[PDB]
Amino acid sequence: LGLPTEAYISVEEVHDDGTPTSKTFEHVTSEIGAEEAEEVGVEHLLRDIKDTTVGTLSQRITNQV
Amino acid sequence: VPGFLQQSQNSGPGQPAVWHRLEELYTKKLWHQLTLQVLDFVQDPCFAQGDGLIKLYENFISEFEHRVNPLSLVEIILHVVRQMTDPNVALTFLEKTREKVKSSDEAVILCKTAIGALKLNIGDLQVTKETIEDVEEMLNNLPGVTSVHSRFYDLSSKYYQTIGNHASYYKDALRFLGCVDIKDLPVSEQQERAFTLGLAGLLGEGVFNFGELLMHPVLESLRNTDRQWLIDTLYAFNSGNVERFQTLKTAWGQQPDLAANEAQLLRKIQLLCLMEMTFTRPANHRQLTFEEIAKSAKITVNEVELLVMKALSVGLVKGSIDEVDKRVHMTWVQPRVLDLQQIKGMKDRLEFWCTDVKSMEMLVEHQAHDILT
Amino acid sequence: MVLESTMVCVDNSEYMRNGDFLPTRLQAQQDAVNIVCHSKTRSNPENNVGLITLANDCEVLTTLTPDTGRILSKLHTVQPKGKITFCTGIRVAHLALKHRQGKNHKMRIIAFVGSPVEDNEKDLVKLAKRLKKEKVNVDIINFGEEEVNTEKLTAFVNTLNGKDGTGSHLVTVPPGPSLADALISSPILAG
C-alpha cells in the first residue's frame, strides 16, 4: 500500500554509543512527479482505472481509508 | 655505524643479541621491519635513561628520512622525549619533528598533542586553549584510525579539570571512552577514570541526563564494592530522591571538589525531583500542586516558584504556572531511559492503540462500500 | 594473444615502501607493471588490463580497458599505507572478470603479492577452490620477500593447477636487490 520510493541522504556524526566510525543515512520525503510529456504517456499507458468524478468519493478513499 | 652498539651492547641480558639482528635489517635497507621492533625498544629499559642517546643514529636517518611512516615516527620521537626532560629544546625538537611530517594522514595531530603535554604543568588561561582548538583538525576525520583520538581527548580531558568547569570534562572525557580505548586498561586506572568522570557528572550546568552515565557499560562497572557512595548517589539523582541524598551526605567520599559545591549539587537534584515526579504521574492528571512539589524536594511553599521557572528556563520541562489555586501544569518531561519493563508497557499502549485504529478502518470501509475503488 | 584479459592486482601495503631492490618497492612495482602490461599487449591487438589495490579494503583504480597509458598514470598517487587483505582481494578481481567486455576473452589475473602476506590456509584453498571451478587461473608472483618460498601460497597455486591443470605458476625473487627486469618469465613464456 505504501509508496515504492524511499530516498535517503548521507549524514555524518560520530558518537561513543554505536561505533567509533559513525555515518548513517537520513530520510528525505519522496513523491512521484510528472512532466507534461511523461504524463501524456503515463495516463495513456494505464487506461485501466481512474478516480473519475474526483470529489467526495476519492477523498473518502484516497486519503481517509 | 656499528661502533655505537659496541658501547651500548653492555646494557642487560640478551641486549647484544638484539642488535645483531637489527644490524642485518639495516643492511637489507628496509626500515619498517626495523620500525616495529623499536616500540619493543621503548619498554626495554627499566630506567629508560640511556635510550635517549639513540638520536644520533636516528638523526642521520630521521633528518632526511621521509621513508619511515610518520605515525610511527611521531610515536618513536614522542617516546624518546620522555626521559629527555629539558623542554626548552624539546619544543624545538618537537617543532623540528612537526615541520618534517606533513603526510596525507596528518601525523601532526599526534605532534600537536605532544606539544600540550610538554605544556602540561604550566599555563591554564591561554597556554593550551590555543593549541587544543587548533588541534581540532578532525574535519576530514575519516574515523576509524582513532590512534590520535585517545591522545587528543586525554589531553583535553586534563584541561577542563584544571579550569574548574566540570561540564566540558564530562562532554569530552566521555568521548575518550568508546574511542580506541576498547577498555581493558589498567583496572586501577579504569576505576580511577570512572570516579573522575562520575563526579564531573553531578557538578555541571547542563548535565541533567543521568541515565546513560549510570548505565555506561565501561566506567560504572569497575566499581561494585570498593566505594559505592558515588554509584549510590548517581542512582539518587536519577530517581530524584532528595531524601536519599540528604541521608547519604555522611557517606560522601572524596569530599573535596564535591563538598565545596553544596548548593549547586542540591540545585541539580532538586531540579530532577520535579522531573522524575511529572514522569510518574499519568498524563491525565499532571496537576502538580505547589505543596505537593515542595514536600518532595524539601522546599518551602513560598519558594517552589523559582524552582519551576528554573526547570523551564533550561528547557527541561514544559508547562505553565497558576499561582491562584497553587498549581503547576506540566506538558512535556524530557524523555529518559527505560530499562526493560517500562518498554514492555510501551508495547501494551501500542496494542491498545493499533486495535483501536484497526476498528475505525473497517468501520469506514464497511459503511462506505459504495464509495470506494 | 588468444584473446586474453588480465586484471592486475597491485600492492600498496605500508611495509611495501622499503627499497630493498632499488627505487623502493614502489618504482620497482611500477617498472614491473610496465614490463607486463605492454608485454601483456602487443600480441593480440585486443587485450585488457586493470589495476586493483590490495589495501585495507575494496580499492580498485582502473577497470577493464584496452588503453595502456591509463594504468601507468593511475599507478602514481598510490603511496602505500595499511595492511593487506589477500583473501578478500582476489574475489574483487574475480567479479571484474564476470562483468567484462565481450566474453570471448580468456580470463586471468596476475597477483602482485608483497609485504608480509596474511592467510590461514584452508580458506585459501577455498579461495583457490572457487576460482579453479570457473575457467579462471590466477598468477600470484612471490615478491616483497615474504616468508621463504611462501609456504602458504604453495598450498594455493597447486590447487588451481592440480589434477595436471597446467597454467600459471608461482614466481619468487631473491631477497637481494635483484632487478625485476624480465625475471618474470614463467607465465609469460608459455603459461
From Swiss-Prot, chain A:
Transmembrane segments: none
Disulphides: none
Coiled-coil positions: none
Cross-link (Glycyl lysine isopeptide (Lys-Gly) (interchain with G-Cter in ubiquitin)): 50
Subunit structure: Component of the 19S proteasome regulatory particle complex. The 26S proteasome consists of a 20S core particle (CP) and two 19S regulatory subunits (RP). The regulatory particle is made of a lid composed of 9 subunits including PSMD7, a base containing 6 ATPases and few additional components. Within the complex, PSMD7 interacts with subunit PSMD4 through their respective MPN domain. Interacts with TRIM5.
Note: Does not bind a metal ion.
Family per similarity comment: Belongs to the peptidase M67A family.
Task performed by this protein: Component of the 26S proteasome, a multiprotein complex involved in the ATP-dependent degradation of ubiquitinated proteins. This complex plays a key role in the maintenance of protein homeostasis by removing misfolded or damaged proteins, which could impair cellular functions, and by removing proteins whose functions are no longer required. Therefore, the proteasome participates in numerous cellular processes, including cell cycle progression, apoptosis, or DNA damage repair.
Protein name: 26S proteasome non-ATPase regulatory subunit 7
Organism: Homo sapiens (Human)
Upper lineage: Eukaryota, Metazoa, Chordata, Craniata, Vertebrata
Parent sequence residues shown: 131 to 195 of 324
Swiss-Prot record, chain B:
PCI domain: residues covered: 168-335
Entry keyword Glycoprotein: no
Residues with PTM N6-acetyllysine: 295
Gene Ontology terms: biological process: meiosis I; proteasome-mediated ubiquitin-dependent protein catabolic process; ubiquitin-dependent protein catabolic process
The UniProt record lists the keyword Transmembrane: no
One function term, GO molecular function aspect: structural molecule activity
Keywords attached to this entry: Acetylation, Proteasome
SMART domains xrefs: PINT
InterPro entries referenced in this protein's UniProt entry, alphabetically: PCI_dom (IPR000717), PSD13_N (IPR054179), PSMD13 (IPR035298), WH_DNA-bd_sf (IPR036390)
Domain of life where this protein originates: Eukaryota
GO cellular component: cytosol; extracellular region; ficolin-1-rich granule lumen; membrane; nucleoplasm; nucleus; proteasome accessory complex; proteasome complex
Function: Component of the 26S proteasome, a multiprotein complex involved in the ATP-dependent degradation of ubiquitinated proteins. This complex plays a key role in the maintenance of protein homeostasis by removing misfolded or damaged proteins, which could impair cellular functions, and by removing proteins whose functions are no longer required. Therefore, the proteasome participates in numerous cellular processes, including cell cycle progression, apoptosis, or DNA damage repair.
Subunit note: Component of the 19S proteasome regulatory particle complex. The 26S proteasome consists of a 20S core particle (CP) and two 19S regulatory subunits (RP). The regulatory particle is made of a lid composed of 9 subunits including PSMD13, a base containing 6 ATPases and few additional components.
Similarity-based family: Belongs to the proteasome subunit S11 family.
Record-given protein name: 26S proteasome non-ATPase regulatory subunit 13
GN (gene name): PSMD13
From Swiss-Prot, chain C:
Biological process annotations from GO: proteasome-mediated ubiquitin-dependent protein catabolic process
Position of the Glycyl lysine isopeptide (Lys-Gly) (interchain with G-Cter in SUMO2) cross-link: 122
Domain of life (superkingdom): Eukaryota
Record's keyword terms, sorted: Isopeptide bond, Phosphoprotein, Proteasome, Repeat, Ubl conjugation
GO cellular component, one term: proteasome regulatory particle, base subcomplex
Start and end residues of each VWFA domain: 5-188
GO molecular function: identical protein binding; molecular adaptor activity; polyubiquitin modification-dependent protein binding; RNA binding
Job description of the protein: Component of the 26S proteasome, a multiprotein complex involved in the ATP-dependent degradation of ubiquitinated proteins. This complex plays a key role in the maintenance of protein homeostasis by removing misfolded or damaged proteins, which could impair cellular functions, and by removing proteins whose functions are no longer required. Therefore, the proteasome participates in numerous cellular processes, including cell cycle progression, apoptosis, or DNA damage repair.
Summary of subunit composition and partner proteins: Component of the 19S proteasome regulatory particle complex. The 26S proteasome consists of a 20S core particle (CP) and two 19S regulatory subunits (RP). The regulatory particle is made of a lid composed of 9 subunits, a base containing 6 ATPases and few additional components including PSMD4. Interacts with NUB1. Interacts with SQSTM1. Interacts with UBQLN4. Interacts with UBE3A. Interacts with UBQLN1 (via ubiquitin-like domain). Interacts with DDI2.
Domain notes: The 2 UIM motifs are involved in the binding to a multi-ubiquitin chain in a cooperative way.
Family: Belongs to the proteasome subunit S5A family.
Name the UniProt record assigns to this protein: 26S proteasome non-ATPase regulatory subunit 4
Full-sequence range covered: 1 to 191 of 377
